[PDB]
Design a protein around this ligand. Structure first.
Ligand SMILES: CC(C)CC(=O)c1c(Nc2ccc(Cl)cc2Cl)[nH]c2c(Cl)ccc([N+](=O)[O-])c2c1=O
Lengths: 119, 114
């Protein structure tokens, strides 16, 4: 973990699971969409310059949702980030959303490479 | 004369069975039960009714709205191999085309069906 990572700090404020990797898709230990939504809003509204490692933790959470076949939650999370990041007055948040979406769509397309043809 | 799937649904209601919460075709939820129903429909009816074709389109669209891509692909491919083995060939193309339009407009992708 890193001192300056928003999501590492949030995970350390939650009660510790013992220090083990969770199997469940999670963002800083949060699993319920209501808890994930709260963390995402706090991140985007309190951090004006998001850290690379935090952006990658969001990508990894989304790719974990894909691997869990939880596309319903993936859609909710992507739409919520789209709303908050694309409306930001900070250009870096729009760039972060583009990066997250691009990486998630590559993972989705490859995971379903035998099923889906991207137009 | 009555829709094949309407008869199934009405028979279910007379036995105390109402719509499942999960996407379903006339009450069938698990792929094993959906297969059995689709096979009965396609093998016993030589001239499928529009009303039944549209209930299958609606079931597939319910799967899309639920993001159940795995089950949508299974159902589309199962129908393909029963309906192409005539008007059933046209019915399959009609069902698939409706699904592909919804997928393209919602997500920018379509089924490969390979
Ligand atoms: C590039 C990618 C392969 C294009 C696509 O196809 C996408 C997709 N497809 C899909 C899902 C369920 C079913 Cl039933 C059928 C289909 Cl086609 N689902 C998403 C969801 Cl659920 C959330 C977020 C995104 N996202 O990242 O924008 C997508 C997405 O792109």
């Amino acid at each position: 973990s890193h001192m300056k990572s928003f999501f590492d700090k949030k995970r350390s404020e939650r009660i510790s699971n013992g220090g083990f990797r969770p199997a469940a898709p999670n963002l800083a230990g949060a699993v319920e969409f209501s808890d994930v939504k709260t963390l995402l809003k706090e991140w985007i509204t309190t951090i004006s310059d998001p850290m690379e490692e935090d952006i990658l933790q969001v990508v990894r959470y989304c790719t974990d949702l894909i691997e869990e076949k939880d596309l319903e939650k993936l859609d909710l999370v992507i739409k919520y980030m789209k709303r908050l990041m694309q409306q930001s007055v900070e250009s870096v948040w729009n760039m972060a959303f583009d990066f997250i979406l691009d990486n998630v769509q590559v993972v989705l397309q490859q995971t379903y490479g035998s099923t889906l043809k991207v137009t």
